[PDB]
Structure formats: C-alpha cells, structure tokens
Motif scaffolding. Sequence first.
Motif, short mmCIF file in Angstrom:
data_model
loop_
_atom_site.label_atom_id
_atom_site.label_comp_id
_atom_site.label_asym_id
_atom_site.label_seq_id
_atom_site.Cartn_x
_atom_site.Cartn_y
_atom_site.Cartn_z
N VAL A 1 40.83 43.25 88.36
CA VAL A 1 39.89 42.85 87.66
C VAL A 1 41.36 42.87 86.98
CG1 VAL A 1 39.10 44.26 85.85
CG2 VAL A 1 38.93 44.85 88.02
N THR A 2 40.61 41.33 85.74
CA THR A 2 41.76 41.33 84.91
C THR A 2 40.65 41.11 83.58
OG1 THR A 2 40.75 38.67 84.96
CG2 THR A 2 42.23 39.97 86.65
N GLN A 3 41.42 40.71 83.16
CA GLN A 3 39.84 41.05 81.15
C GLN A 3 39.25 39.25 81.45
OE1 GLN A 3 44.08 41.63 78.64
NE2 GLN A 3 43.28 40.40 77.56
N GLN A 4 39.12 38.73 82.44
CA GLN A 4 38.34 37.20 82.53
C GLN A 4 37.35 37.76 83.20
OE1 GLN A 4 42.37 36.77 82.69
NE2 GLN A 4 41.99 35.98 80.25
N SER B 1 28.93 39.28 81.83
CA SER B 1 31.02 38.86 81.13
C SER B 1 31.54 40.12 81.56
CB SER B 1 29.81 39.53 79.27
OG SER B 1 30.50 39.11 78.59
N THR B 2 32.46 39.17 80.61
CA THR B 2 33.82 40.13 81.01
C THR B 2 33.98 40.67 80.03
OG1 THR B 2 34.81 38.33 79.42
CG2 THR B 2 34.38 37.50 81.18
N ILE B 3 35.08 41.01 80.04
CA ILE B 3 35.23 42.84 78.87
C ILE B 3 36.26 41.91 77.59
CG2 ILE B 3 38.14 43.10 79.31
CD1 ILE B 3 35.62 45.51 78.83
N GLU B 4 36.52 41.00 77.41
CA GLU B 4 36.92 40.24 76.14
C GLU B 4 35.66 40.50 75.36
OE1 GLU B 4 40.60 37.52 76.56
OE2 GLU B 4 41.26 38.61 77.70
N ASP B 5 34.72 39.75 75.59
CA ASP B 5 33.61 39.10 74.96
C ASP B 5 32.57 39.82 75.16
OD1 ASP B 5 33.61 36.10 75.97
OD2 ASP B 5 31.74 35.82 76.38
N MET B 6 32.83 41.02 75.65
CA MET B 6 31.38 42.53 75.51
C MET B 6 32.40 43.13 74.33
SD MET B 6 29.33 42.53 77.16
CE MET B 6 28.47 44.11 76.65
N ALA B 7 34.55 42.87 74.23
CA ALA B 7 34.61 43.70 73.09
C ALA B 7 34.40 42.92 71.83
CB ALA B 7 36.54 43.08 73.05
N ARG B 8 33.74 41.50 71.78
CA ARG B 8 33.03 40.91 70.58
C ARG B 8 31.80 41.20 70.42
NH1 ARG B 8 35.96 37.30 68.15
NH2 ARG B 8 34.93 34.97 66.93
N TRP B 9 31.11 41.02 71.42
CA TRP B 9 29.64 41.57 71.10
C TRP B 9 29.84 43.31 70.75
CZ3 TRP B 9 25.00 40.22 70.26
CH2 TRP B 9 23.92 40.87 70.65
N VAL B 10 30.79 43.96 70.75
CA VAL B 10 30.78 44.60 70.10
C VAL B 10 31.46 44.96 68.75
CG1 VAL B 10 32.36 47.47 69.80
CG2 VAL B 10 31.01 47.10 71.81
N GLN B 11 31.94 43.95 68.49
CA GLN B 11 32.75 44.04 67.10
C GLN B 11 31.54 43.72 66.21
OE1 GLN B 11 36.16 41.09 68.45
NE2 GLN B 11 37.49 42.25 66.69
N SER B 12 31.01 42.15 67.20
CA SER B 12 30.05 41.45 65.67
C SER B 12 28.52 42.94 65.65
CB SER B 12 29.04 40.67 66.82
OG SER B 12 30.28 39.96 67.30
N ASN B 13 27.88 43.50 66.18
CA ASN B 13 27.38 44.63 66.01
C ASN B 13 27.59 45.27 64.92
OD1 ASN B 13 25.05 44.65 67.98
ND2 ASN B 13 26.09 43.45 68.53
N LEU B 14 29.22 45.60 65.89
CA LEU B 14 29.76 47.13 63.92
C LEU B 14 29.61 46.32 62.40
CD1 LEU B 14 33.48 48.29 65.52
CD2 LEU B 14 31.48 49.68 64.54
N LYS B 15 29.84 44.78 62.68
CA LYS B 15 29.94 44.07 61.95
C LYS B 15 29.34 42.91 61.53
CE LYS B 15 34.63 45.76 58.90
NZ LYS B 15 35.90 45.01 58.39
N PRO B 16 27.81 42.70 61.10
CA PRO B 16 27.12 41.90 61.56
C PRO B 16 27.39 40.90 59.98
CG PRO B 16 25.65 43.92 61.06
CD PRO B 16 27.14 44.55 61.63
N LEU B 17 27.48 41.51 59.25
CA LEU B 17 27.55 40.54 57.40
C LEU B 17 28.41 39.59 57.81
CD1 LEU B 17 27.09 43.35 55.12
CD2 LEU B 17 25.71 41.63 56.29
N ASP B 18 29.90 39.76 58.62
CA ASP B 18 31.23 38.99 59.15
C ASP B 18 30.50 37.74 59.70
N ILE B 19 28.90 37.57 60.46
CA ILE B 19 28.98 36.44 61.26
C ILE B 19 28.33 35.22 59.56
CG2 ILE B 19 26.57 36.08 62.57
CD1 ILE B 19 26.83 39.15 63.59
N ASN B 20 28.41 34.35 60.32
CA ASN B 20 28.07 32.87 59.63
C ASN B 20 26.21 32.98 59.26
#
Length: 352
Positions: free
Chosen positions: A51-54, A222-241
């Motif tokens: 298992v890797t980050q990809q 999905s990969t663990i990197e993309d899911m981490a990004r999904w979590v960050q997006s849901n933690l701070k939706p205001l940063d989304i353009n």
Amino acid sequence: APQQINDIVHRTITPLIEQQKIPGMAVAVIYQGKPYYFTWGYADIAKKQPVTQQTLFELGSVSKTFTGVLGGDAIARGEIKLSDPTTKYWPELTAKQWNGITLLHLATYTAGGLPLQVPDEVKSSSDLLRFYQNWQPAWAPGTQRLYANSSIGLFGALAVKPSGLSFEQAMQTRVFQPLKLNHTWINVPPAEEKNYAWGYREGKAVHVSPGALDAEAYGVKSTIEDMARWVQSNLKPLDINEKTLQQGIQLAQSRYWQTGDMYQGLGWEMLDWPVNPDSIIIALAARPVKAITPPTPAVRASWVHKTGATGGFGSYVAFIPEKELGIVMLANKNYPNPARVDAAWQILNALQ
C-alpha cells in the motif's frame, strides 16, 4: 510528522491491523490543517504490491459524502431545491405513494422505508422506474430514517438531471476537478489499475460489482492523498474558490434531522463535539426522526463522519471543524465499524 502524531497513530493502528487481520491500510491525519500519511501492508497480496500513498481503495458508502456535496452544489446553482417533489425531475414516477416525497427525503433516508439495496435484478432505466413505482412505503415521509442506497442513490441521479450531465461527468467537473482530486474515480481507468488495491473477503481478492445507482451510493475509489484533500475541503469550505461548491459543502453538513445524539446531513452524519466515544456507536435499523425546522447550518463544534464498506473494503472518515482536525482510514478488508470509530477517536482525542 510530529513525533506525537507518529506515536498515537502507530500505537493505535498497529494493534488494529493485527487484531482485525487487515491486509493493507492507509491513514491520513489532518492536523492544524496539514496532512500526514501512513501506510501498512499490502494492496495486492499475491503480487506483493505494498500500500502506498498512490494506492486506490474502494470508499464504499463514504462515496455518499461526494453525492451529498454534488447535490449541495446543484442546489446552490439553483438547479434543484430539496423542497421539490421527487416527481418534478422524474414525471414517470406516477404511483400515488410518491406524493409528498421530496428530494430532501431521498437524500436523508426519510422517504418512508426505501430499501437498503437495489435488487440485483434491477439494471436498465425501465427496470429502475418499475422498482420505484412498485415500492410500498412502510411509513409516511419524514417520520423514520432507514439508511438506504436506493434512497440517496436516487437523489444523486435526480440531482444531476437539470445539468444535462451524466452523474459521473457532473461529479468530475463540479467536484473532483475543482478540488484537485485527480486520482479519485467512479470508474478506474486502465492507466490506474496498477494502483487499484484488491479487496479481501474471506481471504479471496475481490472488487466491487456493477449495480444500479452504484456510482451515486458506493462507487468512488480514491487514494489516501485525495481523501486527505477531501477532508481539508470539508474542514474549510471557505478556502474553496468555486462559489456554488463552497456553498454545496456547507449544505451537506447542515443538520436536517435528529435521531438520538446524531444529526443527518447530505451524506455526512454529525454529532455535537465533544462526543461520548461510545455514543458515536444490524442489517436494518429503523429509527424515528425529529425534523430540524429549519435545518441548522453547519456547526463547527461537530464530529462529522461517515463509515463505508464494500465486500472487500472498509473506510472511515471523521473530522472536527472547530479544531481543524481530521482523519481518513482506508483498508482492504471490511472489518467492524466499532473498531474503526474506536481507533479514530483514540487518535483525534489525543491530538485535540
């Protein structure tokens, strides 16, 4: 990764893997907004691929969070309204039991007892219409919650109709692309198969089988990197353009119904933070729901989460907005939900 994060994660997951006999696992901890990755074991036992980050994992029902956010985005775009009747986007659904059932009921499993699974016999578009036309609700709409793929699945399908895009195209263009989830797929392309882990069920290597409304209910990989990004997006939706997407994320974390200590959002489920770890904690569980009138906008002091499984995989995502803290656990074995939540709580509680 701060040694503290390193230590709680390893001390918690190593034993989990041992006790549950998990072949491979990936974990991401979002701490103060930054992601830290961890991986163990095998993506493919026979071919000895680690298992890797990809590595791609089937998310199972965690896919419902994507569907809920895509639906939130269509609402924000003015394409659909949660208060609309289901019949507005599917006029052929003329059976009388559908009177009064709205997109909100579908999205939140409160339509009146739609089944957990769409039967395997259901395949074509005409097959699906027949299935929903023949369904007889056990309850009036908006009175009981019964977790169901045939419920949020239909919501996902109807929600994209005004857009003119297929559900997969809508998801890619309105959610994946904007958020840079470039290794997240409804259908895994041949170029990416080298990274697609096998799931394991009773020791046998398996992948999720095709099924009606599978994309909408449990088909994202999905990969663990993309899911981490999904979590960050849901933690701070205001940063989304993208304006409507920012709004859609917020709508999916709004509290529409309450059952016990839990609140139902669109895909996401939430509890007030701090939470009793045992409170976060059966093939069919019908529960009466109390409507939250009007819905409470996303509450920062919440434990927001979603469990997911396919026959060969088990996933879990949980985050606490007020603390900029989150976690993603992806594994290629469908092991008990209590064990996933116990591990997540142990890790997040330690960092909070």
